[PDB]
Amino acid sequence: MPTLLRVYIDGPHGMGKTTTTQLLVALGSRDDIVYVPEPMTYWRVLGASETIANIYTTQHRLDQGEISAGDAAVVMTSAQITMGMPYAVTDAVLAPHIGGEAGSPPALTLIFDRHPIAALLCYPAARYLMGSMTPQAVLAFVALIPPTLPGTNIVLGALPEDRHIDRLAKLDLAMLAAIRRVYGLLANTVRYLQCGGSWREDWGQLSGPQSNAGPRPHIGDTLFTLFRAPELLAPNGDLYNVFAWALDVLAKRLRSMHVFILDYDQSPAGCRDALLQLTSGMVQTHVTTPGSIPTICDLARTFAREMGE
Amino acid sequence: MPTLLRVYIDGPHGMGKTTTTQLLVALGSRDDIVYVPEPMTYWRVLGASETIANIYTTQHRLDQGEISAGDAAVVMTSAQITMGMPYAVTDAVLAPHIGGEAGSPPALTLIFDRHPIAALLCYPAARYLMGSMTPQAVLAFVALIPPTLPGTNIVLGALPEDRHIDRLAKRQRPGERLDLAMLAAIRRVYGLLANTVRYLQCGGSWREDWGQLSGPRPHIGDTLFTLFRAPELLAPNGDLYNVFAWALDVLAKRLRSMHVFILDYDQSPAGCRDALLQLTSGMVQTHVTTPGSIPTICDLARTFAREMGE
Amino acid sequence: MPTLLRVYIDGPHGMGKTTTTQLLVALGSRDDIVYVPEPMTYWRVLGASETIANIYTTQHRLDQGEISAGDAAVVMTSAQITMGMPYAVTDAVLAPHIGGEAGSPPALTLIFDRHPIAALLCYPAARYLMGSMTPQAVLAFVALIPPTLPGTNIVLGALPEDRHIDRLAKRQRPGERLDLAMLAAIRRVYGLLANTVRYLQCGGSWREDWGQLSGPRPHIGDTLFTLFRAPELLAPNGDLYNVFAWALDVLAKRLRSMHVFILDYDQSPAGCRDALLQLTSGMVQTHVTTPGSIPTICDLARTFAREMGE
Amino acid sequence: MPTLLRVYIDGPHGMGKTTTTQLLVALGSRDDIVYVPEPMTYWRVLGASETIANIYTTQHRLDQGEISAGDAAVVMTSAQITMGMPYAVTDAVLAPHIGGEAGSPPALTLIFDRHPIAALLCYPAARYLMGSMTPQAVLAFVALIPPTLPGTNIVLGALPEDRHIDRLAKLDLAMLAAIRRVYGLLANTVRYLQCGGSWREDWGQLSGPQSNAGPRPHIGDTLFTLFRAPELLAPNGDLYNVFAWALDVLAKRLRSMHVFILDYDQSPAGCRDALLQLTSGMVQTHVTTPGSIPTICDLARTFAREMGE
């Protein structure tokens, strides 16, 4: 069978991800690499009207004291469903075509602009740090993350805050800090779990980044520490089982992924060549049937056409 | 490896004289049959404050013209995320323990109070019919329905509308409003769900029959697919956008492999208990992956009950 | 046009405490439910002399080595032509009156004692497992199964083997021999029938899975298709001849559209009566083609009963 | 949609049918006309061993007094199942591809060597006249005749008995008489039914050929008169309902067919040109889907390859 390489570029916005991906796609041939872009059309028109403007207005409202936290949470939560639709439906129809892992060329390389966890975990968690989402809602999205398909290669970004801020300024600094923290925690969470970390075993250590390198991080530097809020705990100090189960799901989903860090503090061509090198050691997978390749290509192109602008 | 029998009691609420959870308690006294009751504590306290009350209030305010359709949709979409949480979390931890089918008694019989599709498909669809949810939000929830595992036995109820209205009027839950439009909506969605599984099991191809909506198995007009002919999902030339067509493909794939059993609720609680148990004879059983899969499930069910069921 | 509900009681014989026809008589006292009983008169007199006796004698003689396998096959094939006649004739005159489906009470509920597949598929297949029929004759009968019309509801029974043996030992019919090998054979065929409908309704493609016989749905090894891997149907290179592959395509097409309901017979006649009626709630109903289709059916059933049922 | 022409050549053996059909097929192009031949391989090897030799031996046995009538009937009946298998399975898989009637060129013409009624009605009835089959068994086969697909054109043959006998002799004369009578009755039965004949209305007229031309025949000259045997009647003189229903099926199945008579008392080329002319006024049908034509061709060719020698 032919082999497939799926790469999800993710992490905080404004680091140079779209440019980098586009430069990568440009090097290859027409048919050996397809790009599933940002589904901006879905977020502005197809799924709802101006979902991103709606999200930023709500935050300002709450920040301003124009609305309550409960109201902000209802909006963010409802908006996140719209936000993650494209990522989720794409994963669901892609799923049946993915076979077992092969080994770190591929007949087809699929580069995605973000992964379902961006919408079902990362933004929700960042909004929770911003006060516009409750931890329970975050765990509700966590519980819906689809089973992690084999060969799930995720590329996160590293960019100095000053360089990031400098760049991002053509401005919610809090949201930028919250999103960077969440993605930093996410990288440690993968390492922690692949280094044999058990959140249940280390829960009590809570009180008061490298995704595939370095020593086992402390649970305090992973995503689990966001979920020790009073709302989730009982009168005895510990967390409720529903939420503890959500944490298990989180552990199961992140556990099998292969995450890589891409230094964006370089020129566009440098980033592209850094990403290229990073793809060498990524896990590829076989496809279920002979006709999977063509179908995956058509699926990606149709997504780009209909949803990416 | 031992065998497991999963039975999800579902359908429009308020059909039996006793609740699904009360019926469940009656059956969960054999040692070979454990239940996963309604997570009421989560809906009223844990996940948020009085979520069922919020839902019915919101619908009522929409109907009275006090709030906009978009305002209701935001509340209802967010409310459904909270409502399905326990089901989604239950499915995800139980999934790895479910093996392949066995054939046509089982070591353990797990009986649930609803399946993830009620909070991810059925309730949202009903709210779409009530004007309180967008069809795009409904397909977004459909896109997140967990893969259908082997041995997914779903019991839906049969009950004449007037008897349903009557029986529902006697158990008005905390914050619930007796709404005949919603009862019609929810009963229709479940009837369409039943027809859809049949349609799909009999060869039905939604893409091939789509044209029949605008001009042996049920007609596509009598399945859940008719609901998604909504104008919000169509491009200027009337074609369904591909995003939504993919959600329908997912819907088709998730439903087709489910085994639907119809329970006649027009009888007494005792009768509904016998009936249900009789129905188990034609249900599909699966094998469990590990030797210690029985106990994990039992504890899951016990812990769930203890914590979320009162 | 009024609606009709057809219910075919089938499965391995000797499961309920009362016969299928006796149960039928009990239900045929409402004016909205007519029955088509067992055509015993045809089998013992009309069509030929004591056909059931001939069958069991023949099997017994085969087992004792008094007659050849080919001699038994000739008798058994001819005997099955006679056994299914009434069912085939019933289907063909009733067919033109059956219209398309209605949806998920009916004007008339027609309850039959067996469906053409028992005499055209199930019994012959069992006899193939008993060495008294060739697999080619079984596929020849399968090739003549009338097209499956809409609303084909088939009730099959569930009953633990020892209880089945016990209950069957108390009603030994005229000329019948209590054969445990045949009971195993017939019970297996019906279990495989049930699995086959499921297999097919869930996506199953016999041609695509055929390779698995020699090296979510039931494995093809647990469906009726495994029976036809018999060496008599294969060419020198192991491929199934096309004649037979076409018979399997027909089998696939006839079964897939049937709706199977499992009835637990491990209870009393009264219980089996309630159960059956409860089961009607999830059965598929159809419309009739003409306004005078109700009466024709009633008279058919009445005339049938009167003449062939004692 | 493309149109299809199905023609079933049938009638008594030895009239010049195979030759005629072969000459017909020869005139057309490769792909516009396919021939579904006699499935001799199935009858001699695939379905059973020497089914025809077995049938002729049994008749001789009974004629000789070596076996009883009951024994002969069990054999003939069992043999007929084998005999009609190929015709029946072919009709069953062909069925889904046949659309509604069009009008008396076609994209594809299918010429069959016999129709299911040969095995499910005609031979059984002829064996009943020969005493080797019971009338009840005959009606059991009649009850299994598949629904008559639209565009069912059947061509029967006409040949003087002396010419037929002369020809057939390189010898069961009784069987030849019985088969000719049965096919003669069959032609009248179609005419009778298409002229508004009702067997139930005329049953009492019993006591003591043109298929698409002439006046309404008397029931006494149709197939219904074979079924007034004592075995089928009750003590009150009339027939039993089971059998009466079988007669209805017979009436329903034959009613919609379009039967033609082909004079075989001519030279091979004459027969071919007579058959050609006869196909001009035959009913064609549409096919359900675009790909039906190719599939029907493959089905016919595969039948010819595997079953016709």
Ligand SMILES: Cc1c(C[C@@]2(C)C(=O)NC(=O)N[C@H]2CO)[nH]c(=O)[nH]c1=O
């Ligand atoms: C993915 C995602 C984003 C991220 C997006 C949608 C956002 O903020 N703005 C935009 O221009 N594109 C992306 C940034 O790369 N934002 C959000 O609120 N929820 C989400 O789920």
Ligand SMILES: Cc1c(C[C@@]2(C)C(=O)NC(=O)N[C@H]2CO)[nH]c(=O)[nH]c1=O
């Ligand atoms: C499952 C479900 C219900 C069903 C529930 C939560 C309902 O409304 N009221 C109640 O107290 N318990 C159940 C009835 O079976 N309702 C709803 O709005 N969305 C859902 O997703």
Ligand SMILES: Cc1c(C[C@@]2(C)C(=O)NC(=O)N[C@H]2CO)[nH]c(=O)[nH]c1=O
């Ligand atoms: C239907 C059927 C039966 C079933 C019957 C005829 C059986 O064997 N004995 C009896 O007296 N009535 C039925 C039992 O339900 N048996 C058989 O050999 N071939 C068939 O085709």
Ligand SMILES: Cc1c(C[C@@]2(C)C(=O)NC(=O)N[C@H]2CO)[nH]c(=O)[nH]c1=O
């Ligand atoms: C079709 C048929 C025949 C007819 C056939 C099979 C026969 O007799 N001999 C043979 O050489 N080919 C045919 C004659 O055209 N004979 C029979 O006994 N039963 C049947 O059903």
